[PDB]
Design a binder for this molecule. Structure first.
Ligand SMILES: CCCCCCCCCCCO[C@@H]1O[C@H](CO)[C@@H](O[C@H]2O[C@H](CO)[C@@H](O)[C@H](O)[C@H]2O)[C@H](O)[C@H]1O
Ligand SMILES: CCCCCCCCCCCO[C@@H]1O[C@H](CO)[C@@H](O[C@H]2O[C@H](CO)[C@@H](O)[C@H](O)[C@H]2O)[C@H](O)[C@H]1O
Ligand SMILES: CCCCCCCCCCCO[C@@H]1O[C@H](CO)[C@@H](O[C@H]2O[C@H](CO)[C@@H](O)[C@H](O)[C@H]2O)[C@H](O)[C@H]1O
Ligand SMILES: *[C@@H]1O[C@H](CO)[C@@H](O)[C@H](O)[C@H]1NC(C)=O
Ligand SMILES: [Ca+2]
Lengths: 480, 480, 480, 480
């Protein structure tokens, strides 16, 4: 018992040191106010009205001419700021290099006009795919904006947008350091008709740097031009910390990174020495599976932070020439992947803390309750999600062309979780379909929220009463 | 046991093939992005401001003169697009033929002015009914806009609107291919006063075609003119796929339609051979009743898809002359009916999957729980809906003239489901009636959400504890 | 048993006839679309912008000069409509007579300036009470707008507003039939400064009549001028049916009124013959108490419908002279009281239906469950409302000066019911107080929604398990 | 038993007198309509558009030039009102003295530009701290607006803002009694560039007095200028009652204050005489701990109301000279502290009422239920908050740079309480991260709302069934 308590004590203090080091590392991932660095950029570029007589945003673009009014107007008035040269956005954020506008095109004849309509309609342009993509030169043909450049040649990568996944290739134009040259270039693209019926996407990419808080911010504005016509705007404001060793707390964060990877080396050694004793008996446990998940996610985090996130070859390459476009699209991608991995790792490391709070009879009753009802809650989770996805496919077939919240199948699932909580927009459901809007909503509230929601609760009630009346009979019958 | 498992296995693989074929069919009913084809049309016609100095939408029309500003303004600037002839909306969507504006009128003297007020008020115009409807010529009397045309003669059908159900007859005017002729026609209707005090509805109907994604879109804009005065706008943007065999996946969808109707022939043969053995004993089951519901809904789906939805006689009739109005009002109606039928059929086919997940002792406990509490949940559902409709009739008598959410009795029911979830607009309830708004809301939250909502939960708790303690005593007493 | 079933059968068919007659009566109280008669009047007078260069509504008035812009602007453009004389609003609704603007004033010196500030501040005007009210003539003193008229002399009655209850007396001005005379009168009130620092309320009253649907609509617009400065607007659009016998369905409604008061005579005779047998034993029942409540509310409904609602002496008095103000302020008051009484009566008549659904063993189990848990749910309702009003008084002391939803104590109670459901505006709570906003919200969610909400549920679970295990032991032990 | 009931009776009537006196005291803390005194000031200064061609508020300031448009525009049009001298805001609220604008600055060179960027970027200005704060004179150097004044010399105190805690020192400028002198001063600050890149905060402070209701109102407008660039506006409208003895009800409130502090003297004597008998046995009770909490909070309330809130030395000092700035920043601070203390004291005094409702067998069952489940609910509250803060740290790492509701860690906690209720903005979560937005939301709804929320409920169900079946066996076995 003293050796069991000694081993529990040393693994507890090991885990507590590990949890302290990890919570220090994610204290330095989040600087104190980066939200007020992304929302000023967002409200400068997305929320300002496009022209002085227009009320459209970037968020509410609806046409191609609104996109030209944005590119000639709010984009140029946001990027270029007159000095008290080169532009400091909000007189703080240095615009790095030049921005870049890039277009993706589909071919004429990339779809098939039906045989009874080949007299009336001459041309058709398919939805964006890589097979449908246009490689031909067009327009005046005398620049990089008019000639196709491959994905390998403009150092790009695939972007996952709202209606398609867009290749990193296309028809790009790097802009200029000053507003007047850039306005001349945008007017020369609009005059020669650069965006037409074959256009399926337009990317606007630039990067700023804040010397005060030492953060880059990689901006990507995407406008998707569907085959149906119109405009779907999308944006991405992504901060990067690419220059690490500036302040003392950054050196302490580097020290905690080293101490963290020593902890992860220790846990990988420990779980390998535990799994070698017994093979499939190791996975007949929840905590060994959770330790496997933690060390896999942590090795993936160390791998991203070595081979991807800390490869600032493009930054030193940009610091040679300030008149080019800085390719920060890969650093931002792997910073997003690293933040997702690290957040999920911190989550499961806090879930691991439940090995060490069976310190009491009450906590042991709670733990025994949920471990004994896990199987029956999983069975009813299967049954619940069968009825839940039946309703989601019903709602997708009924409202999928009319309602924003039901437009894709996963959005139907997430909308139903919101309906179960109470986040409804029933006005648009009830005006999309006036008979099955009502019937869908009322039968989903009755059969899910009144009845099947209470069945998880019934499983937990019965298991808690069983565990209490069993561990009380065990406590009494030993005392008799 | 081996033959029972063999029959269960063959009906399981039959059902799984059927579910795969049906989920393929409703993968091809929903194209990937039709929502972005209806919302661009909606934001072009509903959400654009009516005039350049006006802020009213079509959604926020409040008067007859706002309707004339819409018909002279946002409607003409949305329909007619200058080519790089005939108009391509968003340079993608071909306007098919001409649009059509149609009016429904009631008679002077169609109601009775009370005897003490026949001196002051000369004329009264009743709420729209078919008996009150005006058949007389009026105005200049020299067109189709000024002379009544029956429902049989303009090929129309009854429309179910917000305050009435409107006959397909009336005073119609087909518009023109170009903007200037159509503006002349609308100005000639406004000059001669076409809409006056007898007007009860105005329909605007047109159809576009997108060659890129191969979808028609049947637009119907309704403005209802109540007897109280004012305007109630209503719209309907409905996509159709009327040209089937264009792509290869469409041929695969046709093959899956044939394989589906062979499955439905198989299930109708099976359920007839099962019902012939025993009459009313067949309906003493849930799964035989569900199989009856599935084959009835599926036969109705096949009947709509043969005798109604796949009758594109008006499309080939329209392709002869591009200067007429294409009657797509029936195809859109039966496409809505087919989508409702098919969505409900897919829902119950997924519910049928619960015959085949009694594969475990836990799943059998869950199934036995809900099948044994079904009767007592139905009894308390009767009692709950009696108190629920008592509150709904209370709230209709109190707020039915003041609040949008309580304006009709079914909307009172749906508003109370939203209050139970937590979708409240209590500001308008509390300013409609400051005493019974409060009392209604607080007693509805106390008696429904705190007390009667927990009674379903009590039934499910007690039935689950009973089923577990019974199937555990059955498992133990057989082992003793 | 046959005589018991015979008496139950005759009282059941008596109650069913009574419920049919009552549901017919409240089918004719609610005409089919009165909501679209109040919202057109509301959107004409409340929601139109006050001036063509102004964006304020009547709903968003914030100053006295905005009130003059409304009275010179949106009010006159809403009331007076040029004919194709006298004004038909939306060319349907006849403006009856002239409108009337009325002011309530407080005295100079109606409060006490503190002794250290009687040098700087000369005058102070107390919050509106009847003791503080000004009776003096003022201004040019040569009209009814400048001379006090008592409540008995302008036939008015007390109005219960947002911050005070306002007497029906004051300084009134009846306006005119045409727009130009009324604009001259409003400009003459603004020139001579009619609203100043003593003003505490301004009422605007008018009535319209719709000949098409046979409804009056009594409009009262109130602007309250607090002692703090500013404007609190308030409105009331109230439809009346003052001319009864016009259509055939109205005669059938009168016949159902007579049959209803015969039913209420029958039930009063029955409950008096039942209460005379046994005194306080009669009130030891729920259904006898509910019958007492129904016949009291029904006698109050008949009394309002005879002595108040059907006294259309002011209507025939108005029909003599169309150039005066029609006093419909009492008819609207008693129509609101009659609608409240009748809605509550219909509610309890539907609750009475539970005497007659103990037709089954399951329904008897549900009824026995709730009748046996009524006492313990009432005890925990006492305990719950003690903690609930403790939180409401906490939230009133903390947010009562900052948040709209916590401004009065009853609004704190209703806001907490909304928080329990999930209708939160946490942004304004969290910016009103950044420490106790959080602590109030999180401890109210934890202690009410997680814990004390589940205690009602515990009472109902235990009582249902007790009633089922008791009525099953009664069913088994009789069979053994 | 008679002496036990006698002691319970005398402590009950003592507590009831105490509760009446305390509820009278917090009836006079809240005047009837102070909310309509703060919202008129708020809608005058925050919600009016900044210029006649601008639509920005004070609430929606986004730049430094919008702040100059506010200070030259809406602030001057709100403060200065032309008389029928000195300004009465809404012709009721006397502007006391002059306002004051004050700036906080950071030094050039207060951060470290990284070594590879010291060529491009010359200067950097750190986030506001006291060590980074600028003390140097700047600009024209010939006023108080251009020369640093310490916190001890301008009588200020530290302000806790949104992104920092701001010292009470800085660069202040007292404004003027009239609009033209103040406009000259603000134009002279804008001309000489008073706000530049070193500015981190700008305070605008003024005080009004309403003679009608006898309330001061201390306004503090804060604009925070982050290092990222932009503007974060913040406000504080705080009413004070600094002149006590004006009306008779104020004398009754003073009498109730004296009677309250006599009650608190009585309870401190009683709890000291009870704690002296037994030391740590005293704290083995809930009601003795609650009495300790009440008398500690009440002594803190009396201490604030004597040594801080009732020290109106600055008011009589201001009444000598009406041309200076009245320092009401300390009185408002301690009035906020006193309102927090008094509201929490009233809350726990109402919670103390549960000593005296064990008057019944049912109330004793409810009390015994919650006192016996307190320990197991505390254990599961520990386990629940471990999983809850694991999710909050996940959501802070994922959405903390993108979403308003997740910007700080405590706001992540409060957002998750809102998600559990049903106050979601899922659109911004789902567009911040399209993979972990969904996964976070759905796994938080499944694991918290479906499963772990029902575990508190299971504890309460089992404890209530145990207490009922135990106190029924105690009632029966004594009767056998
Ligand atoms: C017992 C089995 C149940 C009985 C059978 C069910 C009832 C069958 C007939 C119901 C009519 O079917 C109903 O038709 C109306 C139009 O008339 C359709 O409505 C559709 O068009 C109307 C207007 O035309 C729109 O207002 C509505 O938003 C749209 O959904 C509705 O979607 C469909 O659901
Ligand atoms: C014990 C049985 C309960 C005691 C009897 C109940 C109290 C009877 C008297 C209550 C007064 O009845 C109450 O009158 C006010 C106006 O004064 C009505 O209010 C009505 O007009 C006022 C203004 O005039 C509006 O503010 C309010 O929105 C409207 O509902 C309210 O709807 C009605 O509910
Ligand atoms: C909870 C629901 C309650 C709804 C029912 C309320 C009670 C309504 C019935 C009360 C008696 O209803 C009463 O009907 C008589 C009919 O002779 C009406 O009388 C009116 O018309 C009759 C005949 O047309 C005239 O002789 C009489 O002078 C006139 O006042 C009276 O205006 C109405 O007051
Ligand atoms: C007196 O009444 C007349 C109307 O007869 C009005 O025009 C005039 O303004 C009033 N006198 C003053 C001083 O306002
Ligand atoms: Ca909710």
């Amino acid at each position: 018992r003293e050796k069991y308590l000694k081993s529990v004590l040393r693994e507890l203090v090991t885990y507590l040191l590990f949890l302290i080091v990890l919570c220090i590392l994610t204290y330095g991932m989040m600087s104190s106010n980066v939200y007020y660095y992304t929302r000023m950029m967002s409200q400068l570029f997305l929320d300002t009205p496009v022209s002085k007589t227009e009320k459209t945003n970037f968020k509410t673009l609806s046409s191609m001419e609104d996109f030209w009014k944005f590119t000639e107007g709010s984009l140029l008035d946001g990027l270029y700021w007159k000095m008290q040269n080169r532009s400091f956005i909000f007189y703080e954020n240095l615009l790095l290099g030049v921005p870049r506008i890039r277009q993706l095109r589909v071919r004429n004849g990339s779809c098939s006009i039906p045989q009874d309509l080949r007299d009336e309609i001459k041309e058709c342009y398919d939805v964006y795919s890589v097979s449908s993509e246009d490689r031909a030169p067009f327009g005046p043909r005398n620049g990089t904006a008019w000639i196709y450049t491959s994905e390998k040649d403009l150092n790009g990568s695939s972007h996952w947008g709202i209606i398609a996944t867009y290749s990193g290739a296309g028809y790009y134009l790097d802009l200029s350091r000053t507003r007047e040259e850039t306005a001349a270039q945008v007017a020369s693209l609009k005059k020669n008709v650069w965006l037409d019926r074959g256009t399926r996407a337009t990317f606007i990419d630039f990067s700023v740097y804040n010397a005060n808080i030492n953060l880059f911010c990689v901006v990507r504005l995407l406008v998707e031009f569907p085959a149906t016509g119109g405009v779907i705007p999308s944006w991405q404001f992504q901060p990067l910390k690419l220059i690490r060793y500036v302040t003392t707390f950054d050196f302490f964060l580097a020290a905690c990174e080293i101490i963290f990877c020593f902890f992860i080396f220790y846990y990988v050694v420990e779980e390998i020495l535990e799994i070698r004793i017994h093979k499939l008996h190791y996975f007949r446990s929840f905590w060994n599976c959770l330790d496997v998940v933690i060390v896999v996610l942590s090795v993936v985090a160390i791998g991203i932070n070595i081979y991807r996130t800390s490869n600032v070859e493009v930054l030193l390459q940009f610091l040679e020439d300030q008149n080019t476009f800085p390719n920060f699209e890969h650093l931002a991608y792997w910073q997003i992947q690293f933040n997702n991995i690290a957040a999920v790792t911190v989550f499961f490391v806090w879930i691991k803390l439940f090995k060490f709070i069976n310190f009491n009879r009450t906590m042991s009753q709670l733990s025994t309750t949920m471990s004994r009802c896990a199987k029956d809650l999983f069975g009813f989770a299967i049954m619940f999600f069968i009825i839940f996805l039946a309703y989601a496919q019903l709602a997708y077939l009924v409202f999928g062309t009319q309602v924003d919240d039901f437009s894709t199948f996963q959005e139907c699932i997430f909308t139903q979780f919101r309906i179960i909580l109470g986040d409804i927009n029933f006005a648009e459901i009830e005006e999309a379909n006036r008979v099955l809007g009502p019937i869908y909503f009322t039968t989903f509230v009755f059969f899910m929220f009144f009845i099947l929601l209470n069945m998880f609760l019934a499983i937990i009630n019965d298991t808690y009463s069983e565990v209490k009346s069993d561990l009380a009979q065990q406590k009494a019958e030993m005392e008799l």
